[PDB]
Paper text:
The metabotropic glutamate receptors (mGlus) play critical roles in modulating synaptic transmission and neuronal excitability, and dimerization is mandatory for these receptors to exert their functions. In addition to homodimers, these class C G protein-coupled receptors (GPCRs) were shown to form heterodimers as well. Here we report twelve cryo-electron microscopy (cryo-EM) structures of the mGlu2–mGlu3 and mGlu2–mGlu4 heterodimers in different conformational states, including inactive, intermediate inactive, intermediate active and fully active conformations. The Venus flytrap domains undergo a sequential conformational change, while the transmembrane domains exhibit a substantial rearrangement from an inactive, symmetric dimer with diverse dimerization patterns to an active, asymmetric dimer in a conserved dimerization mode.
For mGlu2–mGlu4, the Gi1-bound complex was prepared by using ADX88178, an mGlu4-selective PAM,28 together with glutamate and JNJ-40411813, leading to determination of the Gi1-bound mGlu2–mGlu4 structure (2.9 Å at the ECDs; 3.4 Å at the TMDs and Gi1) and a G protein-free structure of the heterodimer (overall 2.9 Å). In contrast to the conformational deviation of the VFTs in the inactive structures, the agonist-bound VFTs exhibit an identical closed conformation in both the G protein-bound and -free structures of the mGlu2–mGlu3 and mGlu2–mGlu4 heterodimers, which resembles the VFT conformation observed in the agonist-bound structures previously determined for their parent homodimers. In the absence of G protein, the agonist-bound heterodimers display an asymmetric dimer interface in the extracellular regions of the TMDs. For mGlu2–mGlu4, the mGlu4 subunit rotates anticlockwise by ~20° (extracellular view) with its helix VI forming extensive interactions with helices I, VI, and VII of mGlu2. The asymmetric dimerization patterns in the G protein-free, agonist-bound structures of the heterodimers, of which the dimer association is mediated by helix VI in one subunit and helices I, VI, and VII in the other subunit, are similar to those observed in the previously determined Gi-bound structures of the mGlu2 and mGlu4 homodimers, where helix VI in the Gi-bound subunit and helices I, VI, and VII of the Gi-free subunit mediate dimerization. For the mGlu2–mGlu4 heterodimer, the dimerization mode in the G protein-free state suggests that mGlu4 is the subunit that transduces signals. This is supported by the previous study reporting that the group III subunits are responsible for G protein activation in the heterodimers between the group II and III mGlus, and was further confirmed by our functional data showing that the mGlu2-blocked heterodimer (mGlu2X–mGlu4) was activated by glutamate at a similar level to that of the wild-type heterodimer while no response was observed for the mGlu2–mGlu4X heterodimer.
Author numbering:
A (entry chain 2): 23 to 110, 135 to 592, 602 to 655, 678 to 750, 758 to 820
B (entry chain 4): 41 to 127, 149 to 374, 385 to 483, 487 to 508, 513 to 682, 694 to 776, 780 to 848
The structure:
């Protein structure tokens, strides 16, 4: 346990993590390049500039009592005892890089009223002034960081996400803060596992495998320390698992975390505190040699580890820090700001308690911890030292002693040839300002974005949601074909006669398929009906060339029977349905009535009787609603059939009754006995009518054949009349 | 403000005498049981060790007992007195709260001071790397968490909620139980509620609504401290939720009367756990015999008098009151563990004294600077028996063996033992009384057979979804389709045989062919018998004596054909159906064609040639029949409407006969082709009278009856039924044609001979 002691009137403590934590045998092992050495040298440089600064403590010199925490809370607490040895002197300590280390040291420092200013600890529970009333920090808490990455996740539509955190006072409170923030943003959590402080590589592999237990999640947030993040990346590479990471300031832009794990870190988004490099610190650090810098006791180990050599072998003088590239650690600015804030507090307290002399007066030899704390909580407002060219950064302390929630967003690239650098692609100044153009996996020419969701989306119109009553992880259950997806929560219906197609919200598709004139079953009678009309036209033509009244009526009577057959096949309408009932009844009656006239002024009487049939037909049709109607099937798989009315009504029966009476009237001519010829027509007419009844009876359904056979009966009925009452007559004039 | 006792060896002490203060006040309300009873246990134990000749002879033990004040930060500044002189106490009795002990542990270990806690149950303090100088006499929460989930399993509910407070005990308690629940798999947490250590106004009212949101999780598990449980129970009374919640208290609420004081109606039947313990009869006598005069060593005892007796030194206080009768007295459950912790440190000192100072009776010179490193190894190696005979021992990590027992709060208002935990549960449900056997489960089971089991995000909630009347439930996980010839059982689990619909007499349509067949057979039997009876030479000359007989037999075969059409469907008979209709139709048509041709030929032996032509026409029909006989000797057809089964399962049974549409058309077409020849011959002949008139009528009847066959037979497709309609219409069509043809010729022959 080496000590860094600097002579001075009053000394400042230091708690930098110079050495990384070791195994069970050793308290702490290797020295870290950036987090331990660079920050310690930054504090030493800041102390050097303060001593020679005439405007800041010109008459009193500032010392140092920096100790190594070895990245452990117990060792840091022993060094805190080393701090409080004088009090049981140390006016203040500039240390506490780790949050658990900061809390452990502040717990002891509260008893002795020793103020503490931290440069890297961002734990949200350190803002509790009741528990830590002597603690301050130049960095913001983790609540703003959780808000920032919640906004980042919302930007990339990242809902179903996995949470990885390291146990302690930093990863934990961070993970609950992040989950609390993401709950309000409708962000789900797949798994929540913790990283132990003393865990082996097999345990890291187990954690990585547990991450893979949910293929649904693709992105994992990291609240682990640098060593834990590095081990997790190594385990992910070993298992050949490709992941995208959204890490906290623990990872940041540290190259040691991605050392040897460049493949598994591709596309990882890491945010870090917004800081600027110090031009003077780079020159100060690059001009350091192990012989010249005897002030630092740990510099020899740094030289041995960085430039691989041995002091005993005497092969370390060849290397130099100027030749090798130098990269400033991000939190150097925060260390400098903390040291300068403590120095400014001391200067203000000396200017308000020792106004006469310039050196440390006798009224301040015991330094009051409470007075000093209330002197740098309020009286610290000055331009940040070593601002690059024109920035307006100032060191400020709020009522909680925290900093400003200003963050920078980075991502890990390839940069063509192997360089594997970090590139800033946004910032969080109380608002997300991502730049997707600089991220080489979010460009439109890179394919679909890496998606981490729980429930796969689905086209609303074809398949509807289920609303499981949860925040996410829903299901897609399609609605039945007679349901329109009017709303995402539940589908609706267009109503009877409308098919929910096209837009699927307002549909209004109604099919109106008809029997058509070219039906397979109707192909027969349409040719027969046309043939009968053609035969009637030939019979009508010779009549004009030649009982005159009886023959003309009969020829005309056969004409409209075939004419109405073409009306039925084509299409039904409002006027068609009305004429269909009246025409069919009248034509059958007039043909039989005209035949009765041949059996027996007389023409006027039979037409007058026929006129009475029309009056009865109108009365029957009036009570039958002769208007057309597109009747809908009981179920949906059919369409409207355009049925005028029920065919089982008395409209057909009443017409047949008059026809039967007229047919029975012609039967009287058989008793009188072309008397033989007419009797044959009635006998055939009754049989063909009697043969139609079984056809209509069995075919209750399939209305197409019902209209087809109806046309068949009327078509051949006229042919029988014209083939038995006029064909023998034509034989004596044409054939003979 | 602390208790100071002079002695050769000083023992530290930390007790929560006062409750946690509200707002900025460090100390709140006095704790009469958690703070006073436990503190007096140390005083009672020290006065008993100092009077025991066999334990530390001639060596007195002092005490420096401080006030924890139930605050983690407040105990740290008090503990500074134990180590201020170092940069003297050899060890301390650890605090009650797990969080309080942690800061004391990492500070006393920092000064090599062993610590033994009597009530600190936390897996965090079990780590030997950070708390190697810390020891405990009670089991850790890891064993308690395993015990809690065992009680949950045995009580037949697996959907519960977790309630915890801020600190290293409540947060690590629910986390340990959740981790053990994940290994179980059958138990899930609906939600987790974390009570802040500095709640605002109405905070406890808000968390009740959080548990009230999920009404399914009627049983909740609470890991809160004594003060929080009292406020949580009070908030339940505000929401009128008494009896709705089933509480699962931790070791912080095992048998304490403070969280249930004035709240007997609420939290009835709450199941509580606590490490195995027995009541100490020596402490009860010691405590009950304390007054304001004899007990002046305890500074807080004067304050305890007002709180216990509800007086002041309000109503005035008389200095003659007794604890055991003027107020309710029941010693704290952890009093025994305080005795064990004091005796364990005293036993180790005696064990270290006999080795370090063998000759000396008091403190030898090489023992006055006691070092914690040497004292600690003697702390872990004590195997004595404490009061009530319980064996106390420390493991390598300084922990105690896992021992637990289960209480239940019942009203008849006391805790009753209902079980125990000794690495396995020994619950006694028959004594548990709360609602009979309350259950807190998600998605209550459904098993009518049709209802499938769907797994939601939480494995506890089994979503319920029926299976339609088309598939069978092979298992509760998924239901699968029945075979197409199988109809699902009444319950969807498994399938059942599909019925059938055979053709038998008694049907509305099948009745007519049977009646006509009887009439047709009788009519054709009478005429053939009449000709055989008296065979007149003029009538037989026109008949031919060979053509008429086969026509009657051929027509009679059609009447026999319809008999087997409706007969029992069999593979032999159904295959022979085409033979019956084919032979009957061909015989009637062929002989009729020959008769028409012979009459036409003479108009514009002879009967011997006519029958040869008819036989030749029969031969070609038979030759074609033989081709159709072997082309597909199909047995029968089963599925008629079952081929395209209906959506419901009301009725799909159908019984058909092996028949082909092409075969039926070809068989009918051959007969119709012969009838077409008769149509042409009859038309030309229509221009002998006894032959033209009947023949013209026969072709007239066949054409019309066949003309109605096409739309009925072809139009029955996609109707209600096809096999039932088709067979009936086919039988009547051939029967009517045979009856009309035979009747038209037989009747004039019988009538002519009647008048002759
Ligand atoms: C998903 O992200 C894209 C940008 O990549 C954005 O345009 C879109 O709106 C996001 N999704 C939703 C539902 O807002
Ligand atoms: C650092 O030490 C080297 C010798 O090791 C010396 O040459 C050099 O001048 C020193 N740098 C200084 C004094 O700035
Ligand atoms: C204590 O003694 C008993 C009796 O010999 C036996 O359990 C063992 O020796 C010791 N027990 C433990 C747990 O060390
Ligand atoms: N800032 C993190 C890590 C410290 C560091 O950046 O080194 C913490 O609060 O502990
Ligand atoms: N066992 C609990 C509370 C014990 C008690 O009632 O004091 C803890 O470790 O915090």
């Amino acid at each position: 346990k080496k000590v860094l002691t600097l002579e001075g009137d009053l000394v400042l403590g230091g708690l930098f993590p110079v050495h990384q934590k070791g195994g069970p045998a050793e308290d702490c092992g290797p020295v870290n390049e950036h987090r331990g050495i660079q920050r310690l040298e930054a504090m030493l440089f800041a102390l050097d500039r303060i001593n020679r600064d005439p405007h800041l403590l010109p008459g009193v010199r500032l010392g140092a009592h920096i100790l190594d925490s070895c990245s452990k809370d117990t060792h840091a607490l022993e060094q805190a005892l080393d701090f409080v040895r004088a009090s049981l002197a140390i006016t203040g300590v500039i240390g506490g890089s780790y949050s658990d280390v900061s809390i452990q040291v502040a717990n002891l420092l509260r008893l002795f009223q020793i103020p503490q200013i931290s440069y890297a600890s961002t734990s949200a529970k350190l803002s509790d002034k009741s528990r830590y009333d002597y603690f301050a920090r130049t960095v913001p808490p983790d609540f703003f960081q959780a808000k920032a990455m919640a906004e980042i996740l919302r930007f990339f539509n990242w809902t179903y996400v996995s949470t990885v955190a390291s146990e302690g006072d930093y990863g934990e409170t961070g993970i609950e803060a992040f989950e609390l923030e993401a709950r309000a943003r409708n962000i789900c959590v797949a798994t929540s596992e913790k990283v132990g402080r003393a865990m082996s590589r097999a345990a890291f592999e187990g954690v990585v495998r547990a991450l893979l237990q949910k293929p649904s999640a693709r992105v994992a947030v990291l609240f682990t320390r640098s060593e834990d993040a590095r081990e997790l990346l190594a385990a992910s590479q070993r298992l050949n698992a490709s992941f995208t990471w959204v890490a906290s300031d623990g990872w940041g832009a540290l190259e040691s975390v991605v050392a040897g794990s460049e493949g598994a870190a591709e596309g990882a988004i890491t945010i870090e505190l917004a800081s600027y490099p110090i031009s003077d610190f780079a020159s100060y650090f690059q001009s350091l040699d192990p012989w010249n810098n005897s002030r630092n006791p740990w510099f020899r180990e740094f030289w041995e580890q960085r430039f691989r050599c041995s002091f005993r072998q005497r092969d370390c003088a060849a290397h130099s820090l100027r030749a090798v590239p130098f990269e400033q650690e991000s939190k150097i600015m925060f260390v400098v700001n903390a040291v300068y804030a403590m120095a400014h507090a001391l200067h203000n307290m000396h200017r308000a308690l020792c106004p006469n002399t310039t050196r440390l007066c006798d009224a301040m030899r015991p330094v009051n911890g409470r007075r000093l704390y209330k002197d740098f909580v309020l009286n610290v407002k000055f331009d940040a030292p070593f601002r690059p060219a024109d920035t307006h950064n100032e060191v400020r302390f709020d009522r909680f002693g925290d900093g400003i929630g200003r963050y920078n967003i980075f991502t890990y690239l390839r940069a063509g040839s192997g360089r594997y650098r970090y590139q800033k692609v946004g910032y969080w100044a109380e608002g997300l300002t991502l730049d997707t153009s600089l991220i080489p996996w979010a460009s439109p020419s890179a394919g679909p974005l890496p998606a981490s969701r729980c429930s796969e989306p689905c086209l609303q119109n074809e398949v509807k949601s289920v609303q499981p009553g949860e925040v996410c992880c829903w299901l897609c259950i399609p609605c039945q074909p007679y349901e329109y997806r009017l709303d995402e929560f539940t589908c609706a219906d267009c109503g009877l006669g409308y098919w929910p197609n096209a837009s699927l919200t307002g549909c209004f598709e109604l099919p109106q398929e008809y029997i058509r004139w070219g039906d397979a079953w109707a192909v027969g009678p349409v040719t027969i009906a046309c043939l009968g009309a053609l035969a009637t036209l030939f019979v009508l033509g010779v009549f004009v060339r030649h009982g005159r009244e009886l023959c003309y009526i009969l020829l005309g009577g056969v004409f409209l029977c075939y004419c109405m057959t073409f009306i039925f096949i084509a299409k039904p309408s409002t006027a068609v349905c009305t004429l269909r009932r009246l025409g069919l009844g009248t034509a059958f009656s007039v043909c039989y009535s005209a035949l009765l006239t041949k059996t027996n002024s007389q023409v006027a009487i039979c037409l007058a009787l026929i006129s009475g049939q029309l009056l009865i037909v109108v009365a029957w049709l009036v009570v039958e609603a002769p208007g057309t109607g597109k009747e809908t099937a009981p179920e949906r798989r059919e369409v409207v059939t355009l049925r005028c009315n029920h065919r089982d009504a008395s409209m057909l029966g009443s017409l047949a009754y008059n026809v039967l009476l007229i047919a029975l009237c012609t039967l009287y001519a058989f008793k009188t006995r072309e008397a033989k010829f007419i009797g044959f027509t009635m006998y055939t007419t009754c049989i063909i009518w009697l043969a139609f009844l079984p056809i209509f009876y069995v075919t209750s359904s399939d209305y197409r054949v019902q209209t087809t056979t109806m046309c068949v009966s009327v078509s051949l009925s006229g042919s029988v009349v014209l083939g038995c009452l006029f064909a023998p007559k034509l034989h004596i004039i044409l054939f003979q | 403000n602390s208790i100071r006792i002079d002695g050769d060896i000083t023992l530290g002490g930390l007790f929560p005498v006062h409750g946690r203060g509200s707002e900025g006040k460090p100390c709140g309300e006095l704790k009469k049981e958690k703070g006073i009873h436990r503190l007096e246990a140390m005083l009672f134990a020290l006065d008993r060790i100092n009077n025991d000749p066999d334990l530390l002879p001639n060596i007195t033990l002092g005490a420096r007992i401080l006030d924890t004040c139930s605050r983690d930060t407040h105990a740290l500044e008090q503990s500074l007195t134990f180590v201020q002189a170092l940069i003297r106490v050899v060890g301390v009795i650890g605090a009650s709260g797990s969080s309080v002990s942690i800061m004391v542990a990492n500070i006393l270990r920092l000064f090599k001071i062993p610590q033994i806690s009597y009530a600190s149950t936390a897996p965090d303090l079990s780590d030997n790397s950070r708390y190697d100088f810390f020891s405990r006499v009670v089991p850790s929460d890891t064993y308690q968490a395993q015990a809690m989930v065992d009680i949950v399993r045995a009580l037949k509910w697996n959907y519960v909620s977790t309630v915890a407070s801020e600190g290293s005990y409540g947060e690590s308690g629910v986390e340990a139980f959740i981790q053990k629940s994940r290994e179980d798999g059958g138990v899930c947490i609906a939600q987790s509620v974390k009570i802040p250590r500095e709640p605002k106004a109405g905070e406890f009212d808000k968390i009740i609504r959080r548990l009230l949101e999920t009404s399914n999780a009627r049983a909740v598990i609470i890991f809160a401290n004594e003060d929080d449980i009292r406020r949580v129970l009070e908030a339940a009374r505000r929401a009128n939720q008494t009896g709705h919640f089933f509480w699962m208290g931790s070791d912080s609420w095992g048998s304490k009367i403070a969280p249930v004081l004035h709240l007997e109606e609420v939290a009835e039947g709450a199941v509580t756990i606590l490490p195995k313990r027995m009541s100490v009869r020596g402490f009860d006598r010691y405590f009950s015999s304390r007054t304001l005069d004899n007990n002046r060593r305890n500074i807080w005892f004067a304050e305890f008098w007002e709180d216990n007796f509800h007086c002041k030194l309000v109503k005035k206080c008389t200095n003659r009151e007794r604890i055991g009768q003027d107020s309710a007295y029941e010693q704290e459950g952890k009093v025994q563990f305080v005795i064990d912790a004091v005796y364990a440190m005293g036993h180790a000192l005696h064990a270290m004294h006999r080795d370090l100072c063998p000759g000396r009776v008091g403190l030898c010179p090489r023992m006055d600077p006691v070092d914690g490193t040497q004292l600690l190894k003697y702390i872990r190696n004590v195997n004595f028996s404490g009061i009530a005979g319980n064996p106390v021992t420390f493991n390598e990590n300084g922990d105690a063996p896992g021992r637990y027992d289960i209480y239940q709060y019942q009203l008849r208002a006391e805790y009753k033992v209902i079980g125990s935990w000794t690495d396995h549960l020994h619950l006694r449900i028959e004594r548990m009384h709360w609602q009979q056997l309350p259950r807190s489960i998600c998605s209550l089971p459904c098993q009518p057979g049709e209802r499938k089991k769907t797994v939601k995000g939480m494995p506890c909630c089994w979503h319920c979804e029926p299976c339609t009347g088309y598939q069978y439930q092979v298992d509760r996980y998924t239901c699968k389709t029945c075979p197409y010839d199988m109809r699902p059982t009444e319950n969807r689990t498994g399938c059942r045989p599909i019925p059938i619909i055979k053709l038998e007499w008694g049907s509305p349509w099948a009745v007519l062919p049977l009646f006509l067949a009887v009439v047709g057979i009788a009519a054709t039997l009478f005429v053939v018998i009449t000709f055989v009876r008296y065979n007149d030479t003029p009538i037989v000359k026109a008949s031919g004596r060979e053509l008429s007989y086969v026509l009657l037999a051929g027509i009679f075969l059609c009447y026999a054909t319809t008999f087997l059409m409706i007969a029992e469907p069999d593979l032999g008979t159904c295959s022979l159906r085409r033979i019956f209709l084919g032979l009957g139709m061909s015989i009637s048509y062929a002989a009729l064609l020959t008769k028409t041709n012979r009459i036409y030929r003479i108009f514009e032996i002879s009967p011997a040639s006519q029958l040869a032509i008819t036989f030749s026409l029969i031969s070609l029909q038979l030759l074609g029949i033989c081709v159709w006989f072997v082309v597909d000797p199909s047995h029968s057809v089963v599925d008629f409407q079952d081929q395209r089964t209906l959506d419901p399962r009301f009725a799909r049974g159908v019984l058909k006969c092996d028949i082909s549409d092409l075969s039926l058309i070809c068989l009918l077409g051959y007969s119709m082709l012969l009838m077409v020849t008769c149509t042409v011959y009859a038309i030309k002949t229509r221009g002998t009278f006894n032959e033209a008139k009947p023949i013209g009528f026969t072709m007239y009847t066949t054409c019309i009856v066949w003309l109605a066959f096409i739309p009925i037979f072809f139009g029955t497709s996609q109707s209600a039924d096809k096999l039932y309609i088709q067979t009936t219409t086919l039988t009547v069509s051939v029967s009517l044609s045979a009856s009309v043809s035979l009747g038209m010729l037989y009747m004039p022959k019988v009538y002519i001979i009647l008048f002759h």
